[PDB]
RNA sequence: CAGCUAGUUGGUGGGGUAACGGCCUACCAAGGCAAUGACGUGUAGCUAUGCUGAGAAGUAGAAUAGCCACAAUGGGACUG
RNA sequence: AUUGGGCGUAAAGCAAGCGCAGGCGGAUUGAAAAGUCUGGUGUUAAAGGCAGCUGCUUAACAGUUGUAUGCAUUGGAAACUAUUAAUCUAGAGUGUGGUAGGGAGUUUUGGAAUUUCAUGUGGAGCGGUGAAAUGCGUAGAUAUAUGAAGGAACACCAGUGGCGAAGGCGAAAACUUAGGCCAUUACUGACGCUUAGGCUUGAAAGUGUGGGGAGCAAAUAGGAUUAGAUACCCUAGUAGUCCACACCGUAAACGAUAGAUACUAGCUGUCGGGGCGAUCCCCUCGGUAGUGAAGUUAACACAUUAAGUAUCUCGCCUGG
RNA sequence: CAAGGAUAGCACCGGUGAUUGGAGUUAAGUCGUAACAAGGUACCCCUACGAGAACGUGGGGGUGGAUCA
């Protein structure tokens, strides 16, 4: 239910790339949604709250890099959850 | 810790610290400010020149004087010379330094200045504890 | 695989002998 | 074999009634040829402790090299957390050091030295740190031979 | 200098002549003692017992 | 020399060099490994040229992108290593830059300083002679 | 001390002192300085340099002297 | 502390994690030269800082020249601080295969056992410490045996422990499931780490609301040793302890040990992964521990998880 | 051009204060040795309350405890 392989084969940039910054941020966002459902269901899960903060801010760092380095590398990545 | 951690913390040697913060102020009137004029000397008036039981490291009848300087703070000093001319209103000159054998007393007096006479023809002190001219 | 090689270095064999001689 | 003393430590051990006074001493032995040796010992009285320390120090004598006879590279020595810093003094600035530091430097045959003792003033670890600082310096010949490059510059 | 029969539980930074001779296994220690005797024996110009045999006396301790 | 395993990248490469060398001399090791930069290959080569460390092998896997270097530490016939403890000068956050007028001589003409002045790694004497100054990289004496 | 700032900030015409120009005025206006420390806040003329230590720097701006302000305080204007 | 330290026991690591700014960060080519360096020009007025010189009885003291204590400008190299492009991953992490743990929270169930309730009995005690005492009790107490309600936590399993951001988790189970572990060649391809700001949690107490007080117990009531005694103990008993929204967002938050990166023996012993065999006695890499080499420390003592090795960063201690 | 003006509730800085809190030094304290030994009772700490007061218990944390496998 972690969406381990499903989210990784989706946003691939090349023929074989299972660790693409795009698929890393997609996995991070999927895990953030899952862990947010976790946190609303479990308000006293402290460890998961810390892990969720880690994941969301690592996603922020990855997005910052993907805008910093290559435009096209995040031209197909505009699906980040917002609003 | 690294350079930035050592940068985040201030790295500057100030001085050797003392415990005499009442030896800096000498102010004028018509202006509510303290003037710093690198004064080599300060004066004051001792009011409570009496005898109380001193602190433990020395057992005697150590006499003390509550002096007010030219500053605002009022501090306690140790009597200079065998026998004092500090007649409870004497405007004399005050030294620095700390004595560690009296309670509340960590100051000194420039003895001899315009209102004091001590220990003439002494073997040890004659001007720092002001006195007339001795021989060798 | 390697790309450079320079300054071959060797040392004595790993059996310590104090002063090497006492004759 | 001068066997010069530097500091005696007044000590006393508590026992069944009274306190046994066995004050320790530390001596430095040298023969004006660069020989240096430090020895700490203790006994009931001054002469026995001095003799024991003299024997312990003279049991090991060491000579250090002299080239540009100052500590020609800045170095701080610590032996039991005692800072003794020695830095190269030019041969015309005059020697400025502390008494124990002067003794250690001049016993080794050196010249004017830029010394600075820091923090604590207990002479035992002062002597230990000064000895460690002076003796850990390497000779120009040492690097000149150990490195493949023979030139020492 | 020091000559010792170092064991794997010992340290090799202590002896001026490190020799991997076991005392638990006597085949090394007996041989080394005999050959150390024989060195000074031939140094003193007397008949020598060992140090030229392919397999010397089997002094295996029980 | 095939690695048969890739080493893991450090926070910074010069600190990786320092850590590997110091732990090799501490653990009585003779071979050290580090990343391969043009700067770092140059610094290793200039250290070798001054008799500080032994043979160096630059290992490229499939491109200059994945390049490392394995170098042996010099060991004199007296079993004394020529590496007396390497140190870095181009420190991250402590980048010390000395002009030509501020090029020093290591412990009063005993050691060697590594200076990339304007075109490449240069030893102390040639850097003084070349009347050109620049970055000081590492200290080995 | 987390914001400071409505001739402050920009331009057009006019006037303007030692000169083009917000230097100021009429129009239109909301721009302008700052989290990397803006502004307010207390001291301090700045500097060459007096001096101290070995260095980091500190001290005072004093002897001696270079530039602004200063003229009982705030202004206004005179000649120039 | 830039010349010149520590944060386990000294003044001595936020309480911890997450992470923007900041601070710094694997390699590549070539460029801009943003900086670094290079060399020049102007110039930093005089005494003077330094220095050449001059004098007054020497000196004190005064004067002249320059170097200059600074700044503006200038053309270069691309090695270096930072940027540029992409493939390499090798740390960020990710995939496939497997994977241990009481992780956490929420939910579900259960009664061994006590109390109330039901059956009884029974005689003179029970309750308990240091000796006893307060208290319950002939109306039946204590005891005696199970059963419904109740709620607490769940004997051993329990590891020279695992997991866990420290904090904490032990009947069993489920959901989300954080992170631990390798086989990790493969994979975007330096993306990174600390991180004042900020966010969160940080035991438990206690406490606002709804419950039980069955059991415990602060406060409380009594007896008791202290010269009293509130303090040892014992007995009971309100909130509370236990649950949920929770709050205080504090600790002996302990490894008294801040994190991340790269490396460092052996051994002692608990554990995980892959691999291949009966399991221990097999290898590799890691999590939590220790003796101990080198290394470090003021010593005690860290030591593969450092207080090491070096780096990066933040916070703190510059006496009580 | 421009000196100063003052408005009503409002806005700042310094000091004192009838009564004196806390603090540390004082020929010289009683209440206790609570705690340091296992301190005659394990401690101390976070928290709740007692206690004139050491300190105590309630939940939680460890040893800043020990002879001893």
Widest Cα–Cα separation across chain D: 68
Residue F54 CA to residue F45 CA, distance in Å, equals 10
User: Which residue in D25, D12, D87 sits closest to D57, CA to CA?
Assistant: D25
Q: What are phi and psi of D144, to 5 degrees?
A: -60, -35
Contacts of A4 (CB under 8 A, 6+ apart): none
- Asked if C17 lies within 8 A of E17 by C-beta distance, the reply is yes
Residue D143 CA to residue E1 CA, distance in Å, equals 28
Q: What are phi and psi of F54, to 5 degrees?
A: -85, -165
Show the domain range for A15.
Answer: 1-83
Q: How far is CA D126 from CA A36, C15, D18, D41, D62, in A?
A: 63, 40, 31, 16, 19
Mind telling me how many Å the CA of E62 is from chain C's nearest CA? 32
Residue A65 CA to residue A70 CA, distance in Å, equals 9
User: With contact defined as beta carbons under 8 Å apart, do D137 and D110 qualify?
Assistant: no
Burial zone of B121 (CB within 10 Å; 0-12 exposed, 13-18 middle, 19+ buried) = exposed
Structure tokens at F115: 């200076």
**Strands F97-98, F90-91: parallel, antiparallel or unpaired by DSSP?**
unpaired
Residue B46 CA to residue B42 CA, distance in Å, equals 13
Way the structure was solved: cryo-EM
CA-CA-CA-CA dihedral for D107, D110, D111, D116, to nearest 10: -80
Q: What are phi and psi of D75, to 5 degrees?
A: -155, 140
Nucleotides on strand G lying under 7 Å from protein C-beta: 43, 54, 56-57, 60
Interface present between F and C (3 or more CB pairs within 8 Å): yes
- Asked if C7 lies within 8 A of F54 by C-beta distance, the reply is yes
Structure tokens at B15: 């001085």
Mind telling me how many Å the CA of F98 is from chain B's nearest CA? 18
- Asked if E1 lies within 8 A of C15 by C-beta distance, the reply is no
Structure tokens at D2: 């001068």
Residue A14 CA to residue A8 CA, distance in Å, equals 12
Mind telling me how many Å the CA of C14 is from chain F's nearest CA? 10
* Nucleotide nearest F86, from its CA to each C1': H310
Q: Which residues of C touch E16 (CB under 8 A)?
A: 16-18
User: With contact defined as beta carbons under 8 Å apart, do C3 and F60 qualify?
Assistant: yes
DSSP E24-56: SSHHHHHHHHHHHHHHHHHHTTS---SSS-SS-
Interface present between A and B (3 or more CB pairs within 8 Å): no
User: With contact defined as beta carbons under 8 Å apart, do B107 and B100 qualify?
Assistant: no
Contacts of D92 (CB under 8 A, 6+ apart): none
Count of H helices and E strands in chain C? 0, 0
Structure tokens at C9: 């270095």
Nucleotides on strand H lying under 7 Å from protein C-beta: 1-7, 10, 13, 17-29, 35-39, 76-82, 84-97, 103-106, 164-167, 175-179, 185-193, 198-202, 244-246, 258, 260-265, 293-295, 297-299, 308-319
Structure tokens at F15: 């600190």
Closest-approach residue (CA) in chain E for C21: E1
Distance of CA F87 to the CA centre of its chain: 9
- Asked if F54 lies within 8 A of C4 by C-beta distance, the reply is no
Structure tokens at D131: 């000895």
B–F CB contacts, 8 A cutoff, strictly below: 5
Q: Which residues of B touch F95 (CB under 8 A)?
A: none
Residue D29 CA to residue E24 CA, distance in Å, equals 47
Instruction: Write out residues whose CB is closer than 7 A to strand G.
Output: B 12-13, 33, 36; D 116
**Strands E17-19, E3-5: parallel, antiparallel or unpaired by DSSP?**
parallel
Phi/psi region, residue E47 (left: phi>0; alpha: psi -120 to 50; beta: rest), is: beta
For chain C, the residues whose C-beta falls within 8 A of a C-beta of chain F are 1-9, 11-12
User: Angle at the Cα of B94 (from B90 to B98), degrees rounded to 5?
Assistant: 130
Hey, is the C-beta of E17 within 8 angstroms of any chain C C-beta? yes
DSSP E strands, B1-136? 42-51, 63-69, 74-78, 91-94
Count the neighbouring beta carbons within 10 Å of the beta carbon of residue F116.
18
User: With contact defined as beta carbons under 8 Å apart, do B95 and B107 qualify?
Assistant: yes
**Strands D83-88, D75-78: parallel, antiparallel or unpaired by DSSP?**
antiparallel
Residue F69 CA to residue F1 CA, distance in Å, equals 10
Q: How far is CA F99 from CA D91, E17, F116, F131, in A?
A: 28, 53, 11, 10
User: Which residue in D149, D142, D146 sits closest to D72, CA to CA?
Assistant: D142
Count the neighbouring beta carbons within 10 Å of the beta carbon of residue A8.
19
Structure tokens at F95: 């980048």
What total of structural domains would you count in chain A?
1
Interface present between B and C (3 or more CB pairs within 8 Å): no
Hey, is the C-beta of B1 within 8 angstroms of any chain F C-beta? no
User: Angle at the Cα of D127 (from D125 to D128), degrees rounded to 5?
Assistant: 60
DSSP F32-88: EEEE--HHHHHHHHHHHHTTSEEEEEEEESSSTTSEEEEEEEPB-TTS-BS-S--EE
User: Which residue in E60, F101, F94, D87 sits closest to B4, CA to CA?
Assistant: F94
Q: Which residues of F touch C2 (CB under 8 A)?
A: 1, 57-59
User: With contact defined as beta carbons under 8 Å apart, do B34 and B15 qualify?
Assistant: no
Mind telling me how many Å the CA of D80 is from chain F's nearest CA? 22
Residue A57 CA to residue A26 CA, distance in Å, equals 14
Q: What are phi and psi of F33, to 5 degrees?
A: -125, 150
Which residues in chain F (26-45) have CB-CB distances under 8 A to chain C? 41, 45
Any idea how long chain B is?
136
**Which F residues between 70 and 109 have a beta carbon under 7 A from any strand H atom?**
85, 87-88, 90-95, 97-101
Q: Which residues of C touch E17 (CB under 8 A)?
A: 15-18
Q: Helix F38-49 and helix F13-26: axis angle, to 10°?
A: 40
Helix (H, G, I), strand (E, B) or coil at D59: coil
Q: What is the 3-state secondary structure (H, E, C) of A29-83?
A: HHHHHHHHHHHHHCCCCHHHHHHHHHHHHHHHHHHHHHHHHCCHHHCCCCCCCCC
Q: What are phi and psi of B88, to 5 degrees?
A: 65, -10
Burial zone of A20 (CB within 10 Å; 0-12 exposed, 13-18 middle, 19+ buried) = middle
B50 Cβ nearer than 7 Å to chain I strand? no
Structure tokens at E14: 């202590």
């Amino acid at each position: 239910q972690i969406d381990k392989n499903g989210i990784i084969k989706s946003a691939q940039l090349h023929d074989k790339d299972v660790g693409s910054i795009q698929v890393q941020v997609s996995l991070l966002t999927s895990q953030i949604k899952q862990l947010t459902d976790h946190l609303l269901a479990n308000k006293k899960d402290f460890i998961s709250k810390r892990g969720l903060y880690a994941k969301v801010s690592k996603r922020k760092r990855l997005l910052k890099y993907l805008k910093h380095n290559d435009l096209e590398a995040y031209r197909n990545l505009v699906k980040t959850l917002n609003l | 810790a690294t350079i930035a951690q050592l940068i985040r913390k201030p790295r500057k040697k100030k001085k050797v610290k003392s415990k005499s913060p009442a030896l800096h102020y000498n102010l004028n009137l018509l202006n509510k400010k303290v003037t710093n004029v690198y004064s080599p000397l300060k004066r004051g008036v001792c009011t409570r020149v009496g005898t109380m039981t001193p602190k433990k490291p020395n057992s005697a009848l150590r006499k003390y004087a509550k002096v007010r300087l030219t500053n605002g703070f009022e501090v306690l000093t140790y009597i200079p010379g065998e026998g004092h001319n500090l007649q409870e209103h004497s405007v004399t000159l005050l030294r620095g330094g700390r004595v560690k054998d009296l309670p509340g007393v960590r100051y000194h007096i420039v003895r001899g200045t315009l209102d004091t006479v001590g220990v003439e023809k002494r073997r040890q002190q004659r001007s720092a504890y002001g006195a007339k001219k001795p021989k060798a | 695989r390697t790309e450079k090689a320079q300054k071959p270095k060797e040392e004595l064999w790993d059996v310590v002998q104090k002063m090497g001689n006492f004759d | 074999f001068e066997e010069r003393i530097v500091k005696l430590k007044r000590i006393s051990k508590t026992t069944k009634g009274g306190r046994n006074m066995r004050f320790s001493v530390l001596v430095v032995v040298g023969n004006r040829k660069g020989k240096i040796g430090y020895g700490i010992a203790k006994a009931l009285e001054v002469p026995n402790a001095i003799k024991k320390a003299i024997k312990a120090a003279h049991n090991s004598l060491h000579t250090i090299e002299i080239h540009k006879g100052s500590i020609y590279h800045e170095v701080i020595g610590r032996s039991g957390a005692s800072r003794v810093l020695l830095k190269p003094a030019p041969q015309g600035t005059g020697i400025i050091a502390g008494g124990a530091i002067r003794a250690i430097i001049e016993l080794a045959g050196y010249s004017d030295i830029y010394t600075k003792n820091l923090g604590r003033n207990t002479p035992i670890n002062m002597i230990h740190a000064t000895m460690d600082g002076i003796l850990k310096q390497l000779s120009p010949r040492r690097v000149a031979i150990l490195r493949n490059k023979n030139l020492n510059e | 200098p020091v000559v010792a029969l170092c064991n794997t539980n010992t340290n090799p930074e202590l002896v001026d002549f490190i020799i991997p001779a076991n005392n638990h296994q006597p085949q090394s220690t007996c041989l080394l003692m005999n050959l150390l005797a024989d060195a000074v024996a031939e140094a003193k110009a007397m008949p020598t017992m060992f140090a030229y045999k392919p397999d010397e006396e089997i002094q295996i301790e029980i | 020399i095939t690695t048969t395993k890739p080493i893991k990248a450090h926070f910074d490469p010069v600190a990786d060099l320092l850590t590997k060398i110091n732990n090799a001399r501490k653990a009585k090791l003779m071979t050290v490994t580090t990343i391969a930069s043009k700067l770092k290959i140059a610094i290793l080569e200039i250290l070798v040229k001054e008799g500080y460390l032994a043979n160096f092998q630059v290992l490229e896997n499939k491109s200059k992108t994945k390049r490392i270097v394995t170098f042996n530490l010099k060991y004199t016939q007296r079993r004394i290593p020529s590496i007396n403890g390497v140190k870095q000068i181009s420190k991250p956050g402590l980048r010390i830059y000395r002009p030509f007028e501020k090029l020093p001589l290591v412990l009063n003409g005993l050691g060697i300083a590594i200076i990339s002045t304007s075109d490449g790694v240069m030893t102390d004497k040639v850097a003084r002679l070349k009347k050109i100054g620049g970055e000081i990289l590492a200290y080995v004496w």
